[PDB]
Amino acid sequence: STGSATTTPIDSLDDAYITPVQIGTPAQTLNLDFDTGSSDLWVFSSETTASEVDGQTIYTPSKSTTAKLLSGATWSISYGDGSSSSGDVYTDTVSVGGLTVTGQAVESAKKVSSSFTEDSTIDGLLGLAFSTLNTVSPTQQKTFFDNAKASLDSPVFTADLGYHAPGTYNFGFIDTTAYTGSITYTAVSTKQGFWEWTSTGYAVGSGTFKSTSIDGIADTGTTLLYLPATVVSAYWAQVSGAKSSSSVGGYVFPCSATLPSFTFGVGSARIVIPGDYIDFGPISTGSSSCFGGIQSSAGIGINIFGDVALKAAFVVFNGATTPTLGFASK
Numbered sequence: 639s640t641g642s643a644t645t646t647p648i649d650s651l652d653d654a655y656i657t658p659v660q661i662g663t664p665a666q667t668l669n670l671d672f673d674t675g676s677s678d679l680w681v682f683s684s685e686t687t688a689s690e691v692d693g694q695t696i697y698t699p700s701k702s703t704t705a706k707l708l709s710g711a712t713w714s715i716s717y718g719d720g721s722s723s724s725g726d727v728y729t730d731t732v733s734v735g736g737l738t739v740t741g742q743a744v745e746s747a748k749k750v751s752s753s754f755t756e757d758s759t760i761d762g763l764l765g766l767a768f769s770t771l772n773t774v775s776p777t778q779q780k781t782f783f784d785n786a787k788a789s790l791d792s793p794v795f796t797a798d799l800g801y802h803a804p805g806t807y808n809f810g811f812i813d814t815t816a817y818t819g820s821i822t823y824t825a826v827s828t829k830q831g832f833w834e835w836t837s838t839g840y841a842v843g844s845g846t847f848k849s850t851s852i853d854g855i856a857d858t859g860t861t862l863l864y865l866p867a868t869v870v871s872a873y874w875a876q877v878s879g880a881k882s883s884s885s886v887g888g889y890v891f892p893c894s895a896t897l898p899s900f901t902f903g904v905g906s907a908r909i910v911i912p913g914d915y916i917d918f919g920p921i922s923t924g925s926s927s928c929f930g931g932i933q934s935s936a937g938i939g940i941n942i943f944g945d946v947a948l949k950a951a952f953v954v955f956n957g958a959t960t961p962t963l964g965f966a967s968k
């Protein structure tokens with residue numbers, strides 16, 4: 639089997655991407671944030687504290703004839719931005735782009751933090767990291783991908799995120815029309831539960847490539863590209879007037895600037911992030927200071943190849959017995 643679903647930016651800045659997901663019988667369609675940096679499928683629901691729901695579509699398990707309460711199971715998770723959510727667990731039928739899993743753990747939120755409430759466009763998360771990170775207790779649950787894998791034509795999924803445009807998540811096949819050139823595969827460590835890999839270096843604009851190992855994670859659930867301070871300083875030094883702002887929380891730059899590209903290495907291959915992809919727009923409405931899309935990972939404890947990087951590529955998440963990642967230009 640295979641599945642194929644379109645993923646759409648939530649706003650004009652590509653702050654996150656949502657993908658429609660069918661849950662239950664009859665189907666209830668929710669728009670979820672597919673997150674290769676976590677491993678829980680959780681949804682706003684009829685159980686969510688009423689004051690914490692503001693415009694999201696909810697899952698109502700009592701209206702699904704295939705929903706079953708997973709007795710005694712609870713979950714609780716935190717995200718890189720300090721947001722969090724928690725609740726109880728059902729199993730139900732979940733379909734993505736025509737691919738169906740029965741018995742998928744659907745984590746129903748009883749509580750969500752304010753940043754989830756305030757974002758009406760995201761109805762929950764669909765985790766695609768390794769199932770060892772799943773938070774359900776006392777019996778850990780498998781991700782949608784893990785549950786689907788045995789049925790898939792090939793044990794892979796692919797991320798093809800758009801820049802200010804829709805893109806695609808495919809399960810079970812590699813669309814050879816969706817990329818240029820070849821896919822370069824690279825080793826993954828699963829020891830932290832992430833799609834963790836080592837980039838072979840970087841270049842800024844038309845500058846020379848610096849060969850240096852950069853360990854980090856392929857994370858569709860993080861918006862920006864977080865890299866070591868040395869790398870990020872080298873990038874922003876090429877932008878007149880750019881500075882690191884302690885009060886804003888990162889590098890900012892004049893909105894009048896034209897940004898240079900940023901290249902990262904995948905083995906001997908090179909993925910080029912166009913400069914425009916690094917512009918995250920005014921720091922506050924009406925400002926002429928703009929927020930940068932490449933930020934320091936110092937203090938986060940890991941480098942993160944988030945959407946800024948991934949959207950410049952066609953990315954294969956190969957979930958064979960020894961997982962690997964693939965990257966192609968597009």
Ligand SMILES: N=C(N)SCc1ccc(CSC(=N)N)cc1
Pocket residue numbers: 673674675676717718830857859860938939940
């Ligand atoms: N694990 C560590 N000690 S590094 C801290 C860290 C790890 C992962 C993320 C992204 S989580 C996500 N995409 N839901 C953010 C921060």
Ligand SMILES: N=C(N)SCc1ccc(CSC(=N)N)cc1
Pocket residue numbers: 692755756757758
């Ligand atoms: N806690 C605060 N000082 S402001 C909290 C807050 C953030 C964002 C908005 C606009 S998005 C919306 N209304 N859903 C409204 C309130």
